């Protein structure tokens, strides 16, 4: 509706692209980014400062022509700034004590709602979780419980 | 309504009038449509820019059953 | 071509004794037969048009043609180039062969028939019908029909007046109105 | 008041009042009023002149109108400098060139025509004259 | 119309050959006998013309208009065009599809030694 209205909208997308290049390689693969865009990211930091502007012009160019919300939404989870991400972790730890203290009454909800949960391994993990807590041993396996639930949270496959 | 803007009107129109000699390959008239049709020894450009194909003097003729203005050149 | 012979031996001499035509071939002759078909809703089901073409392929001796939309209209959800109906043109010996099937068996089998129309004329001398329940024809089987359909048959004639069709169909023996 | 319901463009250039007349002679009635001066007629003036003469002529006869507004004009609102687009919609006017007929009359004697046209001539901002239809 | 349809479709070649400024060989079909003419590049005059109507060739054929007889009129017009010195013509479709009795018309001229 206004040429300058598009301008600030496009410029806002430009600084978003400048945030992707300023993000580490290990966390770069987390976002569902296409290979064509991904390949342009690695060349962006290794190019000289003036070429970064051209690369920033590149990154903005084919990022506007496609959908942006899933990329922005996925980036928000990694930054842990989207509201649904932090509450998801709240319920993820809310089912820990619901499961680590009983071990039988909490598995029903997980299997009924999530069909990719390996109940063969989950029961054994709770067996170790009960053993370490009862024997007042350091929680060397409690961390792995959260990783498995977190991994299955976003379709581990 | 946010008006006040116009394009740069490029240089068209009858530009090589009849009775003058031109060298081969020189344009005669730059036109949008086929206001003037190519005639004897005259070629039509991609954008209907009539260009000469041989040396001579340009003459203007109105030929055809539809009274269409044709552009032709004769060897001098 | 038994009607073509019937046209040659009796029809031609009858008309010169009636309208005293100067030229023997000046008398108008049949040119072609038009069978026009239209489904209830083309966009609803394309198989209906395909079945309609199959029915027209059964009634005629040749495969019919599919017609495209003449012009798209935005208010009636019709797009340009979209197949909207089916048709077939018959030429050569096909006029005389198809004409006998119409008047000998097809028209007499029409339910509640009291006479074909005697007013549907364009003003020049070409005579047009639109008939319902094409199932009267024996080629179209009554068990394979999916719905009740119709057919539009028109005659093509070089006649210059509507009154001249009166005489021509009289020679072709249309019963009455 | 008189105005076309639909216009091709919401506003039109100012234009000029140069040139000669076209409708020198009346071709519908026997008597008519012809403009002698040069100026402009608005919708109000046309309505006022027609109303003023209508009260003087009985329904017997016939009345013709030869002037239409056909020309839009706008006015600039208060406390606005030069620019900010063109003016706002206030009213329209018509172009008048001296020599063409304004109103045409028929059906009642000349004496009533003189009285009727005299009453409507004053409310017109231009000097007019009376003419009689001739052969051909 | 029957005649206007072929006239309007053949002027595309007529303008093209006129622009090229080269002689053209034009033929029009008739359901009984076929003509054949050769036109100068100017178009205001002919150079050689030979048809099958002349009785010289109208006695050595079965039917006037046919493929078998088309190779005779085509050869005859080409034979008498050799001494003219033109040595070259340009064929025109003349609004008729290039197949049928028109095949032998051009083939006979090509076989006689005309470069087109």
């Amino acid at each position: 509706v206004s040429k300058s209205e598009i301008k600030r909208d496009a410029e806002e997308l430009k600084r978003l692209g400048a945030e992707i290049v300023d993000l580490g390689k290990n966390a770069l693969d987390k976002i569902p980014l296409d290979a064509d865009l991904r390949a342009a990211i690695e060349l962006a930091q290794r190019i000289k400062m003036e070429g970064r502007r051209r690369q920033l012009q590149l990154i903005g160019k084919m990022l506007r022509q496609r959908d942006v919300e899933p990329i922005r939404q996925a980036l928000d989870k990694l930054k842990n700034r989207h509201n649904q991400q932090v509450v998801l972790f709240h319920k993820l730890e809310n089912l820990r004590d619901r499961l680590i203290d009983q071990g039988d009454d909490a598995i029903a909800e997980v299997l009924n709602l999530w069909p990719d949960a390996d109940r063969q391994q989950l029961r054994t993990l709770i067996r170790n979780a009960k053993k370490e807590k009862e024997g007042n041993k350091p929680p060397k396996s409690a961390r792995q419980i959260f990783q498995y639930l977190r991994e299955l949270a976003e379709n581990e496959g | 309504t946010r008006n006040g803007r116009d394009s740069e009107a490029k240089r068209l129109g009858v530009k090589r009038f009849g009775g003058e000699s031109v060298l081969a390959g020189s344009i005669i008239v730059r036109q949008r449509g086929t206001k003037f049709h190519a005639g004897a020894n005259v070629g039509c450009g991609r954008d209907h820019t009539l260009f000469a194909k041989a040396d001579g003097k340009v003459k203007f003729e109105v030929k055809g059953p539809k009274n269409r203005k044709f552009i032709s050149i004769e060897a001098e | 071509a038994k009607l073509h012979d019937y046209y040659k031996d009796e029809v031609v001499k009858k008309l010169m004794t009636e309208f005293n035509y100067n030229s023997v071939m000046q008398v108008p002759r049949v040119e072609k037969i038009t069978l026009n078909m239209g489904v209830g809703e083309a966009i609803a089901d394309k198989k209906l048009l395909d079945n309609a073409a199959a029915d027209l392929a059964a009634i005629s001796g040749q495969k019919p043609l599919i017609t495209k939309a003449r012009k798209s209209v935005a208010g009636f959800k019709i797009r340009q180039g979209y197949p909207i109906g089916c048709k077939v043109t018959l030429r050569g010996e096909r006029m005389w062969e198809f004409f006998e099937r119409l008047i000998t068996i097809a028209v007499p089998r029409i339910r509640d028939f009291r006479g074909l129309s005697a007013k549907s004329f364009d003003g020049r001398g070409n005579y047009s019908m639109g008939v319902r329940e094409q199932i009267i024809f024996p080629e179209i089987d009554y068990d394979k029909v999916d719905r009740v359909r119709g057919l539009d048959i028109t005659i093509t004639t070089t006649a210059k007046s509507d009154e001249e069709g009166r005489a021509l169909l009289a020679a072709f023996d249309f019963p009455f109105r | 008041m008189l105005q076309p319901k639909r216009t091709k463009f919401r506003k039109m250039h100012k234009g000029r009042n140069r040139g000669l007349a076209q409708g020198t002679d009346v071709s519908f009635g026997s008597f008519g009023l012809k403009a002698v001066g040069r100026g402009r007629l608005t919708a109000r003036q046309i309505e006022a002149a027609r109303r003023a003469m209508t009260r003087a002529v009985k329904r017997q006869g016939k009345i013709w109108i030869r002037v239409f507004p056909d020309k839009p004009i706008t006015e600039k609102p208060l406390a606005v400098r030069m620019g900010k687009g063109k003016g706002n919609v206030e009213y329209w006017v018509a172009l008048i060139q001296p020599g063409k007929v304004l109103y045409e009359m028929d059906g009642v004697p000349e004496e009533l025509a003189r009285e009727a046209f005299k009453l409507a001539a004053a409310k017109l901002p231009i000097k007019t004259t009376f003419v009689t239809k001739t052969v051909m | 119309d029957k005649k206007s349809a072929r006239i309007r479709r053949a002027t595309r070649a007529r303008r093209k050959l006129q622009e090229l400024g080269a002689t053209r060989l034009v033929v029009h079909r008739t359901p009984r006998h076929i003509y054949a003419q050769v036109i100068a590049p100017n178009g205001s005059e002919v150079l050689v013309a030979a048809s099958t109507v002349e009785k010289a060739i109208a006695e050595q054929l079965k039917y006037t208009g046919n493929k078998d007889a088309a190779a005779a009129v085509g050869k005859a017009v080409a034979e008498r065009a050799l001494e003219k010195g033109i040595k070259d013509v340009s064929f025109d479709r003349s609004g008729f599809q290039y197949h049928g009795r028109v095949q032998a018309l051009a083939d006979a001229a090509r076989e006689a030694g005309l470069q087109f």
């Binding site: - | - | 005629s60 001796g61 099937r101 000998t104 007499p108 | - | -």
Partner: protein, 47 residues
């Protein structure tokens, strides 16, 4: 006429119950059973 694109053209012998035997260019099949015909039809009596 183009082959392999049009339906069959087999000769058939049709006959109405009245007794009018005629050969009709049609594609009904092995035989064509009819009940009425152009003749012997009560059209000129009903009107």
């Amino acid at each position: 006429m183009k082959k392999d694109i049009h339906p069959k053209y087999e000769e058939i012998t049709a006959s109405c119950s009245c007794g009018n035997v005629m050969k009709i260019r049609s594609t009904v099949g092995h035989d064509l059973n009819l009940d009425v015909c152009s003749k012997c039809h009560p059209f000129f009596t009903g009107k």
